[PDB]
């Protein structure tokens, strides 16, 4: 299958297979590692677990159509939302971690997730 730049970016921005701790320091480190700190991204959620379950959101296997050309997963995922605190847009970026467990909303292209809808984690 063709490479998809937006799928690759989705993984960088929104996937962490096997996370350490899922506390504030986890968020502060991973947001730096994934290139999300210049400027500090205000909110960002990572999905955990295997990738095949996330990809399957794009199919009937693990998703349903949602709103205007989004998809909502049938399964629930372990997730961690990183929320910026402090009032400055610029590093150092301090984050509060909120771990969760629920279904997720994505957009897909050619069977691959290319966007995470952050609204459900705000």
Residue numbers in the entry: 0 to 121
Could you share sentences copied from the article?
R95 is located on the surface of the molecule in the structure of ANG. It forms part of the β5 strand and interacts with K82 and H84 from the neighboring β4 strand6. Based on previous mutagenesis studies, both K82 and H84 have been shown to have minor roles in catalysis. In the PD variant structure R95Q, the Gln side chain is flexible (can be observed in two possible conformations in the electron density map). However, shortening of the side chain length in the variant seems to have resulted with loss of interactions with H84 thus providing a possible explanation for the diminished catalytic activity of 52%.
